[PDB]
Amino acid sequence: NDVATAKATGETSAKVSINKVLNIAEGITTPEATFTFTFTPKTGTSSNGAPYETIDSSNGQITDKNVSYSGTDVLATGQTNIKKDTGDIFREVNYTHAGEYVYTVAEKQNVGWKVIQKNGSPIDFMTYDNRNYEMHVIVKNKTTGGTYISSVYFKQVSPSVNGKVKPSESGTTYKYDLFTNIYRKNAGKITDPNEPNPNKPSKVDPNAKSLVIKKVVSGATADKSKDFTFKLTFTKASTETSQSITGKIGETSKTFVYGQETTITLRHDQSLVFDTIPAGTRYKLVETGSQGYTASAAYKENGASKNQAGTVSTNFTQDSILIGEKPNDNTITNSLPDVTP
């Protein structure tokens, strides 16, 4: 009932569900896409010498099964894995003669919504799983009656794994986390702050900057030409292969390629923009607090504009704010009190 994983049942049909794992970053709202799984029969020989008795002639035809995702789904402070399973794939299917029935389970590509685009220029990037699997169904006869699904196990044929595929949840419905997909979205301000998530509109600009950081100086008796020092530590995301956000760009005059640890300098009305950068990227801002200057900030973690302030002549640490799928900005204002008359 757990011999090298596999499925289990007593004189009853086994129930099996394919689980689709979808990888996603923090800021991003779940897209509206569907994934499709093909059950194509395969021939060969079994343990007994049965010719993989396979019929698709009305009998033993496993039709394709679907898992859909919508905006209504949420990785509620979970993993980078919003998982959704099929039903029993063996509902509505009937067997006729018994023996070993073998199928080649795969997933089609281009079946979903990487089509969150403007003028053909995309914002996102749906990455599919084009693995090939092999599913063995072992149908035996009931002592009085007809057929019952005794056992089912899987194997991978693409990456040559000489091992049974392990389950997710053993029990009533055996669940199997077969296909794992990744939804990358270079967001930032690319999505506008008008909740146009389910409804694509077109409130989107593909060439909008991701993050914009201004240094503002406040006060009459304040230096507009002082170069204030910022220590920025931008983190990567789940669905980001860019090595420590290799291409963190962020150009004032030079590239300033970032990645996990950096330091920059700004004057009044001077800004450093990162164009078209992935979502789910968190960042730590630390300004070296100058003598007599009080530092404050008015940012946009997702499309929600927030503010934080510090103290006079004190280093200003922001504890991991997030660049997400809706607008992302920050205006760091440095104020100095004007000398009393």
Method: X-ray
- Name residue 36's amino acid: T
Nearest Cα to 14, choosing from 71, 70, 80, 93?
Answer: 93
Return the ∠ at Cα 197 (arms to 323 and 214), rounded to 5°. 30
3-state helix, strand, coil in the chain (%, to 5): 0, 45, 55
Name where the chain breaks: residue before each gap, C-N > 2.5 Å: 201
Token pair 């004032």: residue = 252
- Cα-based distances in Å from 293 to 177, 222, 307: 55, 9, 18
In our burial notation (b when 16+ CB lie closer than 10 A, e otherwise), range 143-155 reads eeeebbbbbbbbe
Interatomic CA distance for residues 238 and 232, integer angstroms: 20
Nearest Cα to 313, choosing from 228, 191, 190?
Answer: 228
Q: Where are the domains of the chain?
A: 1-188, 189-341
In our burial notation (b when 16+ CB lie closer than 10 A, e otherwise), range 34-72 reads ebebebeeeeeeeeeeeebbbeeeeebebeebebebeee
